[PDB]
Design a protein around this motif. Structure first.
Motif, PDB file in Angstrom:
ATOM      1  N   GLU A   1     -97.822  41.431 112.789  1.00  0.00           N
ATOM      2  CA  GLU A   1     -97.620  40.755 114.060  1.00  0.00           C
ATOM      3  C   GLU A   1     -96.154  40.446 114.309  1.00  0.00           C
ATOM      4  OE1 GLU A   1     -99.830  39.362 111.792  1.00  0.00           O
ATOM      5  OE2 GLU A   1    -101.761  38.969 112.781  1.00  0.00           O
ATOM      6  N   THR A   2     -95.825  40.440 115.594  1.00  0.00           N
ATOM      7  CA  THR A   2     -94.570  39.939 116.126  1.00  0.00           C
ATOM      8  C   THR A   2     -94.910  38.962 117.238  1.00  0.00           C
ATOM      9  OG1 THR A   2     -94.222  41.482 117.907  1.00  0.00           O
ATOM     10  CG2 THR A   2     -93.762  42.236 115.725  1.00  0.00           C
ATOM     11  N   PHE A   3     -93.989  38.073 117.552  1.00  0.00           N
ATOM     12  CA  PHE A   3     -94.276  37.055 118.550  1.00  0.00           C
ATOM     13  C   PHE A   3     -93.144  36.897 119.554  1.00  0.00           C
ATOM     14  CE2 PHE A   3     -97.895  35.034 116.387  1.00  0.00           C
ATOM     15  CZ  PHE A   3     -97.693  35.482 115.079  1.00  0.00           C
ATOM     16  N   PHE A   4     -93.505  36.445 120.748  1.00  0.00           N
ATOM     17  CA  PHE A   4     -92.544  35.887 121.686  1.00  0.00           C
ATOM     18  C   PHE A   4     -92.978  34.458 121.933  1.00  0.00           C
ATOM     19  CE2 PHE A   4     -91.585  34.597 126.031  1.00  0.00           C
ATOM     20  CZ  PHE A   4     -90.216  34.771 126.073  1.00  0.00           C
ATOM     21  N   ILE A   5     -92.081  33.503 121.715  1.00  0.00           N
ATOM     22  CA  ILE A   5     -92.371  32.112 122.027  1.00  0.00           C
ATOM     23  C   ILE A   5     -91.327  31.621 123.020  1.00  0.00           C
ATOM     24  CG2 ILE A   5     -93.432  31.625 119.808  1.00  0.00           C
ATOM     25  CD1 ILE A   5     -90.783  30.055 119.281  1.00  0.00           C
ATOM     26  N   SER A   6     -91.548  30.429 123.527  1.00  0.00           N
ATOM     27  CA  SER A   6     -90.641  29.849 124.501  1.00  0.00           C
ATOM     28  C   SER A   6     -89.942  28.658 123.852  1.00  0.00           C
ATOM     29  CB  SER A   6     -91.377  29.482 125.788  1.00  0.00           C
ATOM     30  OG  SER A   6     -92.033  30.616 126.327  1.00  0.00           O
ATOM     31  N   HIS A   7     -88.629  28.801 123.629  1.00  0.00           N
ATOM     32  CA  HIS A   7     -87.809  27.755 123.027  1.00  0.00           C
ATOM     33  C   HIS A   7     -87.745  26.500 123.896  1.00  0.00           C
ATOM     34  CE1 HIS A   7     -84.319  29.690 125.247  1.00  0.00           C
ATOM     35  NE2 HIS A   7     -84.152  28.414 125.531  1.00  0.00           N
ATOM     36  N   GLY A   8     -88.262  26.558 125.133  1.00  0.00           N
ATOM     37  CA  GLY A   8     -88.283  25.399 126.016  1.00  0.00           C
ATOM     38  C   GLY A   8     -86.891  24.872 126.329  1.00  0.00           C
ATOM     39  N   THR A   9     -86.698  23.590 126.055  1.00  0.00           N
ATOM     40  CA  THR A   9     -85.417  22.908 126.119  1.00  0.00           C
ATOM     41  C   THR A   9     -85.341  22.046 124.874  1.00  0.00           C
ATOM     42  OG1 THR A   9     -85.813  20.730 127.091  1.00  0.00           O
ATOM     43  CG2 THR A   9     -86.033  22.620 128.526  1.00  0.00           C
ATOM     44  N   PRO A  10     -84.151  21.552 124.516  1.00  0.00           N
ATOM     45  CA  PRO A  10     -84.039  20.813 123.246  1.00  0.00           C
ATOM     46  C   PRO A  10     -84.970  19.610 123.172  1.00  0.00           C
ATOM     47  CG  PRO A  10     -81.883  21.447 124.036  1.00  0.00           C
ATOM     48  CD  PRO A  10     -82.836  21.711 125.163  1.00  0.00           C
ATOM     49  N   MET A  11     -85.416  19.096 124.316  1.00  0.00           N
ATOM     50  CA  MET A  11     -86.324  17.965 124.310  1.00  0.00           C
ATOM     51  C   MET A  11     -87.597  18.271 123.558  1.00  0.00           C
ATOM     52  SD  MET A  11     -85.423  15.105 125.488  1.00  0.00           S
ATOM     53  CE  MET A  11     -83.723  15.296 125.111  1.00  0.00           C
ATOM     54  N   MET A  12     -87.955  19.535 123.452  1.00  0.00           N
ATOM     55  CA  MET A  12     -89.163  19.891 122.733  1.00  0.00           C
ATOM     56  C   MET A  12     -89.097  19.557 121.258  1.00  0.00           C
ATOM     57  SD  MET A  12     -91.122  23.276 122.202  1.00  0.00           S
ATOM     58  CE  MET A  12     -89.786  24.227 122.856  1.00  0.00           C
ATOM     59  N   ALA A  13     -87.982  19.031 120.762  1.00  0.00           N
ATOM     60  CA  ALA A  13     -87.979  18.561 119.389  1.00  0.00           C
ATOM     61  C   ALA A  13     -88.613  17.182 119.289  1.00  0.00           C
ATOM     62  CB  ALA A  13     -86.547  18.512 118.858  1.00  0.00           C
ATOM     63  N   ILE A  14     -88.487  16.379 120.339  1.00  0.00           N
ATOM     64  CA  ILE A  14     -88.942  14.997 120.309  1.00  0.00           C
ATOM     65  C   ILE A  14     -89.925  14.661 121.418  1.00  0.00           C
ATOM     66  CG2 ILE A  14     -86.773  14.384 119.255  1.00  0.00           C
ATOM     67  CD1 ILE A  14     -85.693  13.503 121.672  1.00  0.00           C
ATOM     68  N   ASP A  15     -89.927  15.383 122.533  1.00  0.00           N
ATOM     69  CA  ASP A  15     -90.824  15.044 123.631  1.00  0.00           C
ATOM     70  C   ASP A  15     -92.227  15.511 123.263  1.00  0.00           C
ATOM     71  OD1 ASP A  15     -90.492  15.100 127.279  1.00  0.00           O
ATOM     72  OD2 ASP A  15     -92.171  14.495 126.000  1.00  0.00           O
ATOM     73  N   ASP A  16     -93.088  14.573 122.920  1.00  0.00           N
ATOM     74  CA  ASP A  16     -94.443  14.913 122.564  1.00  0.00           C
ATOM     75  C   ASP A  16     -95.338  14.945 123.774  1.00  0.00           C
ATOM     76  OD1 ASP A  16     -96.304  15.746 120.738  1.00  0.00           O
ATOM     77  OD2 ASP A  16     -95.798  14.157 119.285  1.00  0.00           O
ATOM     78  N   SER A  17     -94.764  14.820 124.974  1.00  0.00           N
ATOM     79  CA  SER A  17     -95.513  15.054 126.204  1.00  0.00           C
ATOM     80  C   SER A  17     -95.483  16.529 126.598  1.00  0.00           C
ATOM     81  CB  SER A  17     -94.973  14.199 127.366  1.00  0.00           C
ATOM     82  OG  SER A  17     -93.595  14.432 127.668  1.00  0.00           O
ATOM     83  N   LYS A  18     -95.091  17.406 125.672  1.00  0.00           N
ATOM     84  CA  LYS A  18     -95.070  18.824 125.919  1.00  0.00           C
ATOM     85  C   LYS A  18     -96.108  19.471 125.021  1.00  0.00           C
ATOM     86  CE  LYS A  18     -90.386  19.005 127.254  1.00  0.00           C
ATOM     87  NZ  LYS A  18     -91.207  18.632 128.469  1.00  0.00           N
ATOM     88  N   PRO A  19     -97.120  20.157 125.568  1.00  0.00           N
ATOM     89  CA  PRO A  19     -98.060  20.903 124.713  1.00  0.00           C
ATOM     90  C   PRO A  19     -97.364  21.954 123.884  1.00  0.00           C
ATOM     91  CG  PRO A  19     -98.849  20.716 126.929  1.00  0.00           C
ATOM     92  CD  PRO A  19     -97.418  20.376 126.988  1.00  0.00           C
TER      93      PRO A  19
END
Ligand SMILES: [Fe+3]
Length: 263
Positions: free
Chosen positions: A4-22
């Motif tokens: 397998e290979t993947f493409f994911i979405s790095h989002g924005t840096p807030m995704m390290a701490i914002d737990d309101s992001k699925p």
């Protein structure tokens, strides 16, 4: 070894701490629900490292690069000191050169940009798996990156986890949000992409500029979309694409993530 290979979405840096992001709960469940195998090393094609020619990361420890301005200070305290793999770096040089890429540079001093270390800090938090980064050549086209992926395809048998880090949609910082829906143009684009990917219409996605609806709204600048092409190519010709995540930020920034399974 790895199929397998993947493409994911790095989002924005807030995704390290914002737990309101699925997106965050999704990335954190990586080793239990998404990919259980322990890879020998990890290669990340991150959208936040663009160069004129293919470029590889050659260090024995990755510095943690804070390539963002204007965020909580807590974000600049983070260190994802994962090892580098000069082994893998050379293996990538040779594989790329062996496929027609005559000029392929190396950077012996830079670590991981947030496009790699933010997701990887959630998926592989121990920071003990080698991480090597590949750059995206934004002023070229999609077919170039499909070929970069095909060139990388043999890395899978050597225990390498190939991951493209971008955003399913990356509207400009100037595109207006949607208050409580998903913007129509962005749903059109995401629908197009899924229908293309899940059916193996990879030539189409290479030609997004002439087949995708609203691509200028979705990807004004291609850099956040080309890692999709690279993972696509690395999976192979007849790989099977599956959409494993989708969530939205402003009603306009898709977090869609795909898993490509070679057959
Ligand atoms: Fe980004």
């Amino acid at each position: 070894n790895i199929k397998e290979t993947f493409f994911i979405s790095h989002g924005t840096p807030m995704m390290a701490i914002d737990d309101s992001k699925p997106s965050k709960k999704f990335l954190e469940s990586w080793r239990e629900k998404i990919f259980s195998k322990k890879p020998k090393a990890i290669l990340v094609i991150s959208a936040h490292w663009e160069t004129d020619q293919p470029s590889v990361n050659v260090v024995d420890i990755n510095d943690t690069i804070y390539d963002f301005r204007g965020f909580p200070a807590r974000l600049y305290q983070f260190k994802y000191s994962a090892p580098g793999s000069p082994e893998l770096a050379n293996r990538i040089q040779d594989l790329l050169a062996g496929s027609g890429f005559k000029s392929v540079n190396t950077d012996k001093k830079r670590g991981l940009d947030h496009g790699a270390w933010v997701p990887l800090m959630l998926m592989y938090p121990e920071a003990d798996i080698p991480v090597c980064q590949l750059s995206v050549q934004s002023h070229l086209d999609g077919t170039h990156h499909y070929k970069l992926g095909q060139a990388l395809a043999p890395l899978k048998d050597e225990g390498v986890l190939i991951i493209g880090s971008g955003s399913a949609t990356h509207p400009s910082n100037g595109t207006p949000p949607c208050s409580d829906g998903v913007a129509p143009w962005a749903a059109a684009f995401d629908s197009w992409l899924e229908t293309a990917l899940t059916n193996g219409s990879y030539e189409e996605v290479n030609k997004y500029e002439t087949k995708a609806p609203n691509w200028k709204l979705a990807h004004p600048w291609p850099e956040h979309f080309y890692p999709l092409h690279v993972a696509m190519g690395a999976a192979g010709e007849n790989s099977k694409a599956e959409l494993i995540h989708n969530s939205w930020d402003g009603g306009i920034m898709s977090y869609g993530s795909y898993k490509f399974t070679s057959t």
